[PDB]
Design a protein around this ligand. Structure first.
Ligand SMILES: [Ca+2]
Ligand SMILES: [Ca+2]
Ligand SMILES: [Ca+2]
Ligand SMILES: [Ca+2]
Lengths: 172, 172
Protein backbone atom coordinates (compact mmCIF):
# COMPACT_ATOMS: atom_id res chain seq x y z
CA UNK A 1 0.00 0.00 0.00
CA UNK A 2 1.45 3.37 1.05
CA UNK A 3 4.91 1.89 1.56
CA UNK A 4 6.42 3.18 -1.68
CA UNK A 5 6.07 6.53 0.09
CA UNK A 6 8.32 5.27 2.86
CA UNK A 7 11.00 4.12 0.44
CA UNK A 8 10.93 7.44 -1.41
CA UNK A 9 10.99 9.34 1.88
CA UNK A 10 14.03 7.28 2.88
CA UNK A 11 15.88 7.80 -0.40
CA UNK A 12 15.54 11.53 0.20
CA UNK A 13 16.10 12.08 3.93
CA UNK A 14 18.91 9.52 3.96
CA UNK A 15 20.69 10.35 0.71
CA UNK A 16 19.41 12.89 -1.82
CA UNK A 17 18.77 15.58 0.81
CA UNK A 18 22.46 16.42 1.23
CA UNK A 19 24.27 14.87 -1.74
CA UNK A 20 22.22 16.73 -4.36
CA UNK A 21 22.67 20.32 -3.10
CA UNK A 22 26.44 19.66 -2.99
CA UNK A 23 26.85 17.68 -6.22
CA UNK A 24 28.15 20.66 -8.20
CA UNK A 25 30.53 21.54 -5.36
CA UNK A 26 31.88 17.99 -4.91
CA UNK A 27 32.40 17.65 -8.67
CA UNK A 28 34.36 20.91 -8.50
CA UNK A 29 36.63 19.27 -5.94
CA UNK A 30 37.68 16.38 -8.17
CA UNK A 31 40.66 17.68 -10.19
CA UNK A 32 40.36 15.12 -12.98
CA UNK A 33 36.99 16.57 -13.99
CA UNK A 34 37.22 20.27 -13.11
CA UNK A 35 38.86 21.22 -16.41
CA UNK A 36 36.98 18.44 -18.19
CA UNK A 37 34.31 20.14 -20.32
CA UNK A 38 31.28 18.18 -21.62
CA UNK A 39 30.59 17.03 -18.06
CA UNK A 40 26.92 17.42 -17.19
CA UNK A 41 27.03 18.28 -13.50
CA UNK A 42 23.87 16.39 -12.62
CA UNK A 43 22.94 13.06 -11.05
CA UNK A 44 21.19 10.60 -13.33
CA UNK A 45 19.05 8.13 -11.42
CA UNK A 46 18.78 5.07 -13.65
CA UNK A 47 15.66 2.92 -13.68
CA UNK A 48 15.58 -0.56 -15.23
CA UNK A 49 12.35 -2.19 -16.43
CA UNK A 50 11.14 -5.80 -16.22
CA UNK A 51 13.74 -8.36 -15.11
CA UNK A 52 17.27 -9.59 -15.90
CA UNK A 53 24.96 -6.72 -19.55
CA UNK A 54 23.88 -3.19 -20.49
CA UNK A 55 27.10 -2.51 -22.40
CA UNK A 56 27.46 -4.75 -25.49
CA UNK A 57 29.46 -2.30 -27.62
CA UNK A 58 31.31 -1.26 -24.45
CA UNK A 59 30.87 2.50 -24.89
CA UNK A 60 30.61 3.15 -21.15
CA UNK A 61 33.59 3.05 -18.78
CA UNK A 62 34.21 3.75 -15.09
CA UNK A 63 36.56 6.74 -14.83
CA UNK A 64 36.74 7.08 -11.06
CA UNK A 65 34.67 8.64 -8.30
CA UNK A 66 34.06 12.15 -6.97
CA UNK A 67 35.51 13.46 -3.72
CA UNK A 68 33.70 11.81 -0.77
CA UNK A 69 31.22 13.80 1.32
CA UNK A 70 32.31 13.49 4.95
CA UNK A 71 29.20 13.73 7.10
CA UNK A 72 29.45 13.11 10.84
CA UNK A 73 26.33 12.34 12.81
CA UNK A 74 25.80 12.77 16.55
CA UNK A 75 29.40 13.90 16.91
CA UNK A 76 30.74 10.35 16.57
CA UNK A 77 29.52 8.56 13.42
CA UNK A 78 31.42 9.24 10.19
CA UNK A 79 29.99 8.40 6.75
CA UNK A 80 31.39 8.98 3.26
CA UNK A 81 29.23 9.74 0.22
CA UNK A 82 30.93 9.52 -3.18
CA UNK A 83 29.52 9.08 -6.69
CA UNK A 84 30.70 7.12 -9.73
CA UNK A 85 31.39 9.12 -12.88
CA UNK A 86 31.37 7.22 -16.18
CA UNK A 87 32.56 8.06 -19.69
CA UNK A 88 30.18 7.47 -22.58
CA UNK A 89 31.79 7.37 -26.02
CA UNK A 90 29.87 9.20 -28.74
CA UNK A 91 31.54 7.36 -31.62
CA UNK A 92 34.52 9.35 -32.89
CA UNK A 93 33.12 12.49 -31.30
CA UNK A 94 34.28 13.83 -27.94
CA UNK A 95 33.35 11.61 -25.00
CA UNK A 96 30.81 12.53 -22.32
CA UNK A 97 31.27 12.47 -18.56
CA UNK A 98 28.19 11.89 -16.41
CA UNK A 99 27.16 10.66 -12.97
CA UNK A 100 24.97 7.57 -13.03
CA UNK A 101 23.29 5.95 -10.03
CA UNK A 102 21.72 2.50 -10.02
CA UNK A 103 18.81 3.21 -7.67
CA UNK A 104 19.03 0.97 -4.62
CA UNK A 105 15.56 1.51 -3.09
CA UNK A 106 14.06 0.48 -6.42
CA UNK A 107 16.44 -2.43 -6.99
CA UNK A 108 15.47 -3.85 -3.59
CA UNK A 109 11.93 -4.09 -4.96
CA UNK A 110 13.15 -6.14 -7.91
CA UNK A 111 15.51 -8.26 -5.81
CA UNK A 112 12.86 -8.93 -3.16
CA UNK A 113 10.07 -9.95 -5.53
CA UNK A 114 12.43 -12.43 -7.22
CA UNK A 115 13.45 -13.99 -3.90
CA UNK A 116 10.29 -13.48 -1.84
CA UNK A 117 7.24 -13.51 -4.20
CA UNK A 118 4.82 -14.23 -1.35
CA UNK A 119 5.88 -11.00 0.35
CA UNK A 120 6.15 -8.99 -2.85
CA UNK A 121 4.36 -10.17 -5.99
CA UNK A 122 6.16 -9.31 -9.24
CA UNK A 123 2.92 -7.45 -10.02
CA UNK A 124 2.22 -6.08 -6.52
CA UNK A 125 5.66 -4.46 -6.81
CA UNK A 126 4.98 -3.01 -10.27
CA UNK A 127 2.45 -0.78 -8.53
CA UNK A 128 4.87 0.05 -5.70
CA UNK A 129 7.45 1.05 -8.32
CA UNK A 130 5.28 3.45 -10.31
CA UNK A 131 4.26 5.06 -7.02
CA UNK A 132 7.90 5.35 -5.90
CA UNK A 133 9.11 7.10 -9.05
CA UNK A 134 6.18 9.51 -9.04
CA UNK A 135 6.48 10.09 -5.29
CA UNK A 136 10.23 10.69 -5.57
CA UNK A 137 9.69 13.45 -8.10
CA UNK A 138 7.02 15.25 -6.08
CA UNK A 139 9.37 15.27 -3.07
CA UNK A 140 12.39 16.61 -4.97
CA UNK A 141 10.22 18.91 -7.10
CA UNK A 142 9.35 20.62 -3.81
CA UNK A 143 12.96 20.98 -2.70
CA UNK A 144 14.72 24.03 -4.15
CA UNK A 145 18.16 22.67 -3.19
CA UNK A 146 17.58 19.45 -5.13
CA UNK A 147 15.67 21.00 -8.03
CA UNK A 148 17.26 20.49 -11.44
CA UNK A 149 20.19 18.67 -9.86
CA UNK A 150 18.90 15.28 -10.98
CA UNK A 151 17.21 13.38 -13.81
CA UNK A 152 15.28 10.12 -14.01
CA UNK A 153 16.35 7.82 -16.82
CA UNK A 154 14.64 4.58 -17.83
CA UNK A 155 16.13 1.83 -19.98
CA UNK A 156 15.60 -1.77 -21.07
CA UNK A 157 17.26 -4.43 -23.23
CA UNK A 158 15.79 -2.90 -26.41
CA UNK A 159 16.72 0.46 -24.90
CA UNK A 160 20.53 0.26 -25.04
CA UNK A 161 22.05 1.97 -22.02
CA UNK A 162 24.78 3.79 -23.94
CA UNK A 163 22.25 4.97 -26.53
CA UNK A 164 19.59 6.23 -24.12
CA UNK A 165 22.21 8.02 -22.02
CA UNK A 166 23.71 9.76 -25.04
CA UNK A 167 20.19 10.91 -25.88
CA UNK A 168 19.73 12.43 -22.42
CA UNK A 169 23.05 14.30 -22.55
CA UNK A 170 22.18 16.31 -25.68
CA UNK A 171 19.04 17.56 -23.93
CA UNK A 172 20.43 18.20 -20.44
CA UNK B 1 1.22 -0.05 8.50
CA UNK B 2 3.12 -2.86 6.77
CA UNK B 3 5.71 -0.47 5.35
CA UNK B 4 8.38 -1.09 7.98
CA UNK B 5 8.76 -4.46 6.25
CA UNK B 6 9.65 -2.63 3.04
CA UNK B 7 12.26 -0.60 4.88
CA UNK B 8 13.73 -3.73 6.45
CA UNK B 9 13.60 -5.60 3.15
CA UNK B 10 15.50 -2.75 1.50
CA UNK B 11 18.17 -2.54 4.19
CA UNK B 12 18.87 -6.22 3.59
CA UNK B 13 18.67 -6.71 -0.18
CA UNK B 14 20.46 -3.41 -0.79
CA UNK B 15 23.12 -3.55 1.91
CA UNK B 16 23.26 -6.32 4.52
CA UNK B 17 22.90 -9.05 1.87
CA UNK B 18 26.50 -8.71 0.69
CA UNK B 19 28.36 -6.60 3.27
CA UNK B 20 27.62 -8.89 6.23
CA UNK B 21 28.85 -12.23 4.82
CA UNK B 22 32.09 -10.47 3.81
CA UNK B 23 32.72 -8.33 6.90
CA UNK B 24 35.31 -10.73 8.33
CA UNK B 25 37.05 -10.95 4.96
CA UNK B 26 37.08 -7.18 4.36
CA UNK B 27 38.36 -6.50 7.89
CA UNK B 28 41.17 -8.97 7.22
CA UNK B 29 42.11 -6.91 4.16
CA UNK B 30 42.64 -3.64 6.01
CA UNK B 31 46.34 -3.55 6.96
CA UNK B 32 45.89 -1.26 9.97
CA UNK B 33 43.68 -3.81 11.75
CA UNK B 34 44.80 -7.29 10.69
CA UNK B 35 47.34 -7.60 13.51
CA UNK B 36 45.04 -5.61 15.81
CA UNK B 37 43.48 -7.89 18.42
CA UNK B 38 40.56 -6.69 20.57
CA UNK B 39 38.80 -5.97 17.30
CA UNK B 40 35.37 -7.57 17.40
CA UNK B 41 34.84 -8.57 13.78
CA UNK B 42 31.13 -7.83 13.81
CA UNK B 43 28.87 -4.99 12.67
CA UNK B 44 27.09 -3.08 15.42
CA UNK B 45 23.90 -1.46 14.17
CA UNK B 46 23.27 1.50 16.46
CA UNK B 47 19.75 2.58 17.35
CA UNK B 48 18.95 5.88 19.08
CA UNK B 49 15.82 6.42 21.19
CA UNK B 50 13.54 9.46 21.50
CA UNK B 51 14.88 12.60 19.83
CA UNK B 52 17.91 14.94 19.86
CA UNK B 53 26.67 14.78 21.22
CA UNK B 54 27.00 11.09 22.10
CA UNK B 55 30.64 11.58 23.12
CA UNK B 56 31.04 13.93 26.13
CA UNK B 57 34.12 12.30 27.68
CA UNK B 58 35.42 11.73 24.13
CA UNK B 59 36.32 8.05 24.46
CA UNK B 60 35.33 7.19 20.89
CA UNK B 61 37.49 8.07 17.87
CA UNK B 62 37.37 7.48 14.12
CA UNK B 63 40.36 5.34 13.15
CA UNK B 64 39.68 4.91 9.45
CA UNK B 65 37.52 2.71 7.26
CA UNK B 66 37.70 -0.89 6.06
CA UNK B 67 38.80 -1.75 2.53
CA UNK B 68 35.91 -0.84 0.17
CA UNK B 69 33.77 -3.58 -1.37
CA UNK B 70 33.72 -3.05 -5.14
CA UNK B 71 30.44 -4.42 -6.46
CA UNK B 72 29.55 -3.85 -10.10
CA UNK B 73 26.02 -4.44 -11.41
CA UNK B 74 24.72 -4.86 -14.94
CA UNK B 75 28.28 -4.74 -16.21
CA UNK B 76 28.43 -0.97 -15.91
CA UNK B 77 27.51 0.39 -12.46
CA UNK B 78 30.27 0.47 -9.83
CA UNK B 79 29.54 0.89 -6.12
CA UNK B 80 31.85 0.96 -3.09
CA UNK B 81 30.82 -0.32 0.34
CA UNK B 82 33.18 0.51 3.20
CA UNK B 83 32.59 0.63 6.95
CA UNK B 84 33.80 3.00 9.67
CA UNK B 85 35.85 1.45 12.46
CA UNK B 86 36.02 3.37 15.74
CA UNK B 87 38.24 3.14 18.82
CA UNK B 88 36.56 3.00 22.21
CA UNK B 89 38.81 3.83 25.15
CA UNK B 90 38.45 1.42 28.08
CA UNK B 91 39.92 3.78 30.66
CA UNK B 92 43.64 3.19 31.11
CA UNK B 93 43.15 -0.41 29.87
CA UNK B 94 43.66 -1.60 26.29
CA UNK B 95 41.36 0.03 23.70
CA UNK B 96 38.65 -1.69 21.65
CA UNK B 97 38.18 -1.55 17.88
CA UNK B 98 34.67 -2.05 16.52
CA UNK B 99 32.48 -1.28 13.51
CA UNK B 100 29.53 0.98 14.23
CA UNK B 101 26.76 1.86 11.79
CA UNK B 102 24.24 4.66 12.22
CA UNK B 103 21.25 2.89 10.67
CA UNK B 104 20.02 4.79 7.62
CA UNK B 105 16.54 3.26 7.12
CA UNK B 106 15.69 3.96 10.76
CA UNK B 107 17.17 7.46 10.89
CA UNK B 108 15.01 8.45 7.90
CA UNK B 109 12.01 7.72 10.11
CA UNK B 110 13.21 10.12 12.80
CA UNK B 111 14.34 12.82 10.36
CA UNK B 112 11.05 12.58 8.47
CA UNK B 113 8.71 12.72 11.47
CA UNK B 114 10.45 15.94 12.52
CA UNK B 115 10.02 17.50 9.08
CA UNK B 116 6.81 15.86 7.81
CA UNK B 117 4.58 14.94 10.82
CA UNK B 118 1.43 14.91 8.69
CA UNK B 119 2.98 12.13 6.62
CA UNK B 120 4.64 10.40 9.58
CA UNK B 121 3.28 10.96 13.10
CA UNK B 122 5.54 10.64 16.16
CA UNK B 123 3.45 7.65 17.22
CA UNK B 124 2.62 6.20 13.80
CA UNK B 125 6.42 6.15 13.38
CA UNK B 126 7.11 4.67 16.82
CA UNK B 127 5.17 1.63 15.61
CA UNK B 128 7.01 1.56 12.27
CA UNK B 129 10.29 1.57 14.21
CA UNK B 130 9.53 -1.28 16.62
CA UNK B 131 8.31 -3.32 13.64
CA UNK B 132 11.46 -2.53 11.66
CA UNK B 133 13.79 -3.78 14.39
CA UNK B 134 11.72 -6.95 14.82
CA UNK B 135 11.44 -7.42 11.04
CA UNK B 136 15.13 -6.85 10.45
CA UNK B 137 15.98 -9.60 12.89
CA UNK B 138 13.80 -12.34 11.38
CA UNK B 139 15.30 -11.60 7.96
CA UNK B 140 18.87 -11.83 9.23
CA UNK B 141 17.92 -14.60 11.67
CA UNK B 142 16.86 -16.59 8.60
CA UNK B 143 20.06 -15.92 6.69
CA UNK B 144 22.94 -18.12 7.87
CA UNK B 145 25.40 -15.96 5.90
CA UNK B 146 24.36 -12.93 7.94
CA UNK B 147 23.75 -14.84 11.16
CA UNK B 148 25.96 -13.81 14.07
CA UNK B 149 27.71 -11.27 11.86
CA UNK B 150 25.85 -8.37 13.46
CA UNK B 151 24.35 -7.03 16.69
CA UNK B 152 21.68 -4.44 17.53
CA UNK B 153 22.63 -1.84 20.14
CA UNK B 154 20.33 0.82 21.61
CA UNK B 155 21.35 4.01 23.43
CA UNK B 156 20.01 7.32 24.76
CA UNK B 157 21.24 10.45 26.57
CA UNK B 158 21.15 8.63 29.93
CA UNK B 159 22.69 5.67 28.09
CA UNK B 160 26.15 7.06 27.25
CA UNK B 161 27.30 5.75 23.88
CA UNK B 162 30.91 5.00 24.85
CA UNK B 163 29.66 3.24 27.97
CA UNK B 164 26.94 1.09 26.36
CA UNK B 165 29.33 -0.03 23.64
CA UNK B 166 32.02 -1.16 26.08
CA UNK B 167 29.59 -3.52 27.81
CA UNK B 168 28.49 -5.03 24.50
CA UNK B 169 32.12 -5.72 23.58
CA UNK B 170 32.99 -7.49 26.84
CA UNK B 171 29.84 -9.61 26.55
CA UNK B 172 30.38 -10.86 22.99
CA1 LIG C 1 40.24 22.47 -19.49
CA1 LIG D 1 32.23 -0.96 -19.85
CA1 LIG E 1 49.64 -8.19 16.23
CA1 LIG F 1 35.16 11.48 19.45
Amino acid sequence: KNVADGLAWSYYFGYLKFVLPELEKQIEKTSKFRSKEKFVKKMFILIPSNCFDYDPQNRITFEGNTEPLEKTRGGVFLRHYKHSVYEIKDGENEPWFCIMEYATPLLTLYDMSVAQPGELSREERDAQVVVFLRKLQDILEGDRACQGKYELVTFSPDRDLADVMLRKLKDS
